[PDB]
C-alpha cells in the first residue's frame, strides 16, 4: 500500500532494481537510528526454531541463523530448514536489527552486528557457535562472524554460507535482478512495509561497502545447482562463491528453492560438516 | 500518512530539506509519467475564481494563476488573493500537472507547460493573458510565459512574479530551507500525500536546471518585506530577485505571509501595474 512499495514494484517491472535500491539506501538516511547496540529498539532474542539432543548438550556447537535482508523476510526464513535439525542440533535464529515504521535503523553495519553479537553471546552461553546465512544473510553471517572474533574476542566455530554472492562475484545477481526482485513480491514472512524496504536498502548499501575483515572460522559453502535464469556460461560461473572454503556442497534447487523444498539437502550437508569439524 | 511525508518531516527537523528534495526528485523517476501534452492523465481545466467588470467587455487582460509546487497546495492557493480581483479582473487558476489518485507526472517540464498552455488558451479565448505565480509558482509562471511565446505563438501581456528566487539568487531560500519545510507542514489542511511530495521534488529539479530563454513579456516583481529567517547583515540582499523587472513592488509579510496575510497588498500592486 505504501508508495515505496509501488515505486519498487514498478522498478522491478522496468528492470531498474539496482537503481531503486540506491534510492532506498538514500532515503533510509532520514530514518531515526540507533548508534549504540544498547539503543537498539528491539529484542534480538534468538528464536529456538529447533531443539537438539538432551543427552549431549556440553560442547556441541549450536546453529545460529542470521536473518537476511529481504524486506518481505524474517527469522522464519529458516523454519523449513530447522525442521531437519530437530533432535540433532539447537537451531537459533536471530532477527536483523531495523526490521519489523517504529524500528530504529542501525547507524552503520557494525552497530547492528554488535547488537546481534550480544544477543547471540547471551543465548549461546558457552556453547560453540556456528553461524548460518542465506543470500544476503550469508554475507551478513560472515560479517557477523568476523565482528564476534575481532570486536568481541569470541570467534564462532564455523560459518555456513548458503548461496553467497559477495562483492566481485555478483554478475549473476545483476543478470537475474528481475527474478530476484519478483521474488520479493511472491509472498511474505512479515508485512513488507515501506519501513522494511528502507531497511533492506540501507543494508544493501552497508554490504556493498569495503569490509576487509576476514573471519578465521572454517567455511561450509552451500551452493544451489539450478540457475535462477538464463546465463550464457561464457561469462564464467553463475554459481555462488566464497574464497578458500573449508568444504563445498552442491545441493538441488535454485537460489530460492534450495532453502524451501530442498532445505533437507542443505541440512544434510550442514550436519555432515558439523560432525567433520567436531 | 505515507512514509515519504514521514521522512520529509524528519528531514525538516534535521535541517536537511535540500537533501530530501533530491531524494524526492530521484524517486519521482519511478512514477508513471506522460510524455505528450495530450497524454496528460488529468483535465487541466482552469477554475474561475474572480470575475472582472461586466461593463468593460472588449479584451482587457485576464489574470492566470500558475499553481505552485508546494505539496500542500492546490485549488485553494489563490482563493484569498482572488477575492481582491472580484469586479476588477477575471482570475483563472490553472492546475499544475501531476498533482491531481495517481495522476501521471510530466516526463519533462516542457510537456507539463504545453499541457497548461493549451488549457489556458482554451479558457482565455482571445483575451490578453497575464500570468501570476508565487515562489516556485513564480518560476513556473515565467517558464510558462516563455513557452506560450515561443511554442504557442501566444506571448502573454505580462508576468507577475511573487517572491521568485531563480537559480543564481537562491542562497536566501537555501539558508531558510528549514523554514520552507516547516511552512509546508504548518500549511497542511490535510497530510501532504507521497504522490504530491514526489511531484514537488520533480518540479523542484526541473526548476533548478538550465532554462535557456527569457520571456519578452513585461515583469512585475513583488517582494516580501520581511525575511523568513535569520540573515547576517554582512551577507548581501536576501530579497527575492529577477533581472530588469518592469516594475518592483514591496508588500508586508515574509515569503509565506505575504500571500497568506497580505494578499490584498499583492492584488493592489497587480491592479495598479495592469492599469499602467
From Swiss-Prot, chain A:
Outcome when changing residue 178 to N: 3-fold decrease fo the catalytic efficiency and 3-fold increase of affinity
Region (Thioesterase): 71-271
Annotated active site: 135, 255
Impact reported for residue 135 to A: Loss of thioesterase activity. Unable to catalyze the biosynthesis of the 14-membered ring macrolactone narbonolide and 12-membered ring macrolactone 10-deoxymethynolide
Domain of life assignment: Bacteria
Reported impact of residue 163 to A: Retains significant albeit reduced thioesterase activity
Binding-site residues, substrate: 69, 136, 163
Recorded domain comment: Cells lacking the TE domain are unable to produce methymycin, neomethymycin, narbomycin and pikromycin.
General function of this protein: Involved in the biosynthesis of 12- and 14-membered ring macrolactone antibiotics such as methymycin and neomethymycin, and pikromycin and narbomycin, respectively. Component of the pikromycin PKS which catalyzes the biosynthesis of both precursors 10-deoxymethynolide (12-membered ring macrolactone) and narbonolide (14-membered ring macrolactone).
Subunit structure: Homodimer. Pikromycin PKS consists of a combination of multimodular (PikAI and PikAII) and monomodular (PikAIII and PikAIV) polypeptides each coding for a functional synthase subunit which participates in 1 (monomodular) or 2 (multimodular) of the six FAS-like elongation steps required for formation of the polyketide. Module 1, 2, 3, 4, 5, and 6 participating in biosynthesis steps 1, 2, 3, 4, 5, and 6, respectively.
Further remarks about this protein from its record: Type I modular polyketide synthases (PKSs) catalyze the step-wise condensation of simple carboxylic acid derivatives. Organizationally, type I PKSs are arranged into modules, wherein each module is comprised of a set of catalytic activities that is responsible for a single elongation of the polyketide chain and the appropriate reductive processing of the beta-keto functionality. A minimal elongation module contains an acyl transferase (AT) domain, an acyl-carrier protein (ACP) domain, and a ketosynthase (KS) domain.
Name of the protein described by the UniProt record: Pikromycin polyketide synthase component PikAIV
Residues of the full protein shown: 1057 to 1339 of 1346
Amino acid at each position: 500500500a505504501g508508495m515505496f512499495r509501488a515505486l519498487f514494484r514498478q522498478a522491478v517491472e522496468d528492470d531498474r532494481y539496482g537503481e531503486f535500491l540506491d534510492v532506498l539506501a538514500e532515503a533510509s538516511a532520514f530514518r531515526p537510528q540507533f548508534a549504540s547496540p544498547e539503543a537498539c529498539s528491539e529484542r534480538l532474542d534468538p528464536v529456538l526454531l529447533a531443539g537438539g539432543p538432551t543427552d549431549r548438550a556440553e560442547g556441541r556447537a549450536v546453529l545460529v541463523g542470521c536473518t537476511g535482508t529481504a524486506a518481505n523476510g524474517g527469522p522464519h526464513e529458516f523454519l523449513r530448514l530447522s525442521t531437519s535439525f530437530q533432535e540433532e542440533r539447537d537451531f537459533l535464529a536471530v532477527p536483523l536489527p531495523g526490521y519489523g515504521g517504529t524500528a530504529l535503523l542501525p547507524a552503520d553495519l557494525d552497530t547492528a552486528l554488535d547488537a546481534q553479537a550480544r544477543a547471540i553471546l547471551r543465548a549461546a552461553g558457552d556453547a560453540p557457535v556456528v553461524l548460518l546465512g542465506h543470500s544476503g544473510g550469508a554475507l551478513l553471517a560472515h560479517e557477523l562472524a568476523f565482528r564476534l572474533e575481532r570486536a568481541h574476542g569470541a570467534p564462532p566455530a564455523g560459518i555456513v554460507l548458503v548461496d553467497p554472492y559477495p562483492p566481485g562475484h555478483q554478475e549473476p545477481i545483476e543478470v537475474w535482478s528481475r527474478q530476484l526482485g519478483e521474488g520479493l513480491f511472491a509472498g511474505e514472512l512479515e508485512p513488507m512495509s515501506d519501513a522494511r524496504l528502507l531497511a533492506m536498502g540501507r543494508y544493501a548499501r552497508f554490504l556493498a561497502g569495503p569490509r576487509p575483515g576476514r573471519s578465521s572460522a572454517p567455511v561450509l559453502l552451500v551452493r544451489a545447482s539450478e540457475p535462477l535464469g538464463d546465463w550464457q556460461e561464457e561469462r564464467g560461473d553463475w554459481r555462488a562463491h566464497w574464497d578458500l572454503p573449508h568444504t563445498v556442497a552442491d545441493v538441488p534447487g535454485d537460489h530460492f528453492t534450495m532453502m524451501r523444498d530442498h532445505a533437507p539437502a542443505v541440512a544434510e550437508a550442514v550436519l555432515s560438516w558439523l560432525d567433520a569439524i567436531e
